[PDB]
Design a binder for this molecule. Sequence first.
Ligand SMILES: CO[C@H]1O[C@H](COS(=O)(=O)O)[C@@H](O[C@@H]2O[C@@H](C(=O)O)[C@@H](O[C@H]3O[C@H](COS(=O)(=O)O)[C@@H](O[C@@H]4O[C@H](C(=O)O)[C@@H](O[C@H]5O[C@H](COS(=O)(=O)O)[C@@H](O)[C@H](O)[C@H]5NS(=O)(=O)O)[C@H](O)[C@H]4O)[C@H](OS(=O)(=O)O)[C@H]3NS(=O)(=O)O)[C@H](O)[C@H]2OS(=O)(=O)O)[C@H](O)[C@H]1NS(=O)(=O)O
Ligand SMILES: O=c1ccn([C@@H]2O[C@H](COP(=O)(O)OP(=O)(O)O)[C@@H](O)[C@H]2O)c(=O)[nH]1
Ligand SMILES: CC(=O)N[C@H]1[C@@H](OC[C@@H](O)CO)O[C@H](CO)[C@@H](O)[C@@H]1O
Length: 493
Amino acid sequence: MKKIFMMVHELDVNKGGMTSSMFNRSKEFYDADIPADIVTFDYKGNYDEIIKALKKQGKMDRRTKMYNVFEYFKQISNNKHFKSNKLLYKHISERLKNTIEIEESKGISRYFDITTRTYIAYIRKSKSEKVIDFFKDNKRIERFSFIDNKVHMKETFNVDNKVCYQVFYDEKGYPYISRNINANNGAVGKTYVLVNKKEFKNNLALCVYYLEKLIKDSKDSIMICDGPGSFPKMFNTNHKNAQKYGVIHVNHHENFDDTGAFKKSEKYIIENANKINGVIVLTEAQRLDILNQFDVENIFTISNFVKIHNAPKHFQTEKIVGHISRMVPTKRIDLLIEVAELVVKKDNAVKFHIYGEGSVKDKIAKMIEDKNLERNVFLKGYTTTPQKCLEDFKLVVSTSQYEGQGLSMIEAMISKRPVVAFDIKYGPSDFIEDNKNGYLIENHNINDMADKILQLVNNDVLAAEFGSKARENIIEKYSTESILEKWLNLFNS
Ligand SMILES: CO[C@H]1O[C@H](COS(=O)(=O)O)[C@@H](O[C@@H]2O[C@@H](C(=O)O)[C@@H](O[C@H]3O[C@H](COS(=O)(=O)O)[C@@H](O[C@@H]4O[C@H](C(=O)O)[C@@H](O[C@H]5O[C@H](COS(=O)(=O)O)[C@@H](O)[C@H](O)[C@H]5NS(=O)(=O)O)[C@H](O)[C@H]4O)[C@H](OS(=O)(=O)O)[C@H]3NS(=O)(=O)O)[C@H](O)[C@H]2OS(=O)(=O)O)[C@H](O)[C@H]1NS(=O)(=O)O
Ligand SMILES: O=c1ccn([C@@H]2O[C@H](COP(=O)(O)OP(=O)(O)O)[C@@H](O)[C@H]2O)c(=O)[nH]1
Ligand SMILES: CC(=O)N[C@H]1[C@@H](OC[C@@H](O)CO)O[C@H](CO)[C@@H](O)[C@@H]1O
């Protein structure tokens, strides 16, 4: 009866909390006999390989389907032919016939016509990927992109060598979508779906049509929008019965802002709460802040579902401080390096294991070296097994300035690893009980945080006691039953 469609930009293998919560939410709805699938809107040439990898890793439940806008029309297109598009491949081969090949490296080569003496093509082969750039009067006109020698995309270039047009090709090499690209901002213009002879004014129009085709207009159909920038796709559909929910995963205020500004995407979701079935926030404090600040009522608090597995059989007695996150500015890993410097200057035995990848990773690497912490702080890369990494840590640290909730802190507490976190909006004070299951540090206070890490790393009994109470607190306050009943209460009203 009930079926759920959870919307986000894309799915990939080295992501953070938002997709992690969608994957766990899907598992919980399927266990309660409610199919809950993921709808994505990006274009990938190898989506089938991403899905298999996420499922093999155990991140994505085997029952979770991913519905993708390009995949839907590509699959319709695949059914149209039996034979591969031999003529497109013959056309490409003919344009390279009667040329001079000039090799630059392995995989890289250039082609010059024997008669016109001019530069025809550039080919770059790396692994399973191939790119063929064609030229006219020493200017790049087009690029054909291949995966396992099969064309998947053609891009056209303007005078400034910027993308002005794209064509997507199915599994047999036939075009199924063609679209204009505004080279000034990279936005998608008029899109033509060759397979059904339908044209759309832009990508949002295509995505709105797609959702109306995918999701039947029944009260049993439930749309949950997780990706904030994706909210207009769900919001603009013509559904009269299907339910619409927006989940806000972050602090709705603008990050690194003293003017009090609100994030644009989240502001649009909140302001439109009364026009949909509900806008979900992860903590009670955010719901109250929103209600005080905005003229809306449809704000509901529903925590992320929590996966309570078995606690690691042994406590880490070694001075290992862990940190598992997306390496992004809001996590303030620079403050963690500054804290590490203080902890290491009072105790040189304490190790800091930092997992993840992101924009700040290089800045942080240079920062450890400049502070000469290369013997104590280790950038361990992304982990597909955070639960196993958690066993190696004595405690976990959070210098993050903004959260919606904080699954890594919650995950550490489930593995009996106490958290030392800056008391920020939102999340830490909901689950950390200061001096009972961890420590809540006054925001920016790097000295008091360094002091609490030192007390904790050098006290085996306190570290074990805090961790034990931490798992107990999560089990008690984040039951799957109460969270599922909160969602069911909305779906049934
Ligand atoms: C006239 O042009 C002007 O308006 C149009 C829209 O109006 S129109 O309909 O009249 O044409 C604007 O075009 C639209 O918006 C563009 C844009 O916002 O850039 C663009 O949207 C697409 O691309 C965005 C960027 O993609 S990215 O892959 O390069 O980042 C994308 O938004 C991004 O979403 C990701 C995400 O959710 O994955 C965000 O990343 C964040 O979350 C990740 C996942 O979380 S997790 O925890 O790991 O699981 C994290 O990994 C990541 O660290 C984190 N980044 S962080 O900074 O928050 O820490 C990322 O920040 C976003 O940028 C869009 O996805 S969406 O869900 O937001 O919709 C995506 N839309 S899609 O292609 O349809 O999927 C498009 O060109 C267009 O989108 S639209 O929906 O088709 O309308 C146009 O820009 C504007 N030009 S302007 O006026 O000059 O500014
Ligand atoms: O190397 C890494 C880094 C992050 N994560 C996961 O990404 C999520 C991060 O969640 P959180 O809410 O703490 O922060 P967010 O990424 O949403 O900003 C957690 O479930 C982590 O286990 C992971 O699996 N491996
Ligand atoms: C930094 C931040 O606010 N992250 C939140 C969010 O992640 C997604 C964020 O990338 C979207 O831009 O979602 C997680 C799961 O709900 C929260 O636990 C987490 O706090």
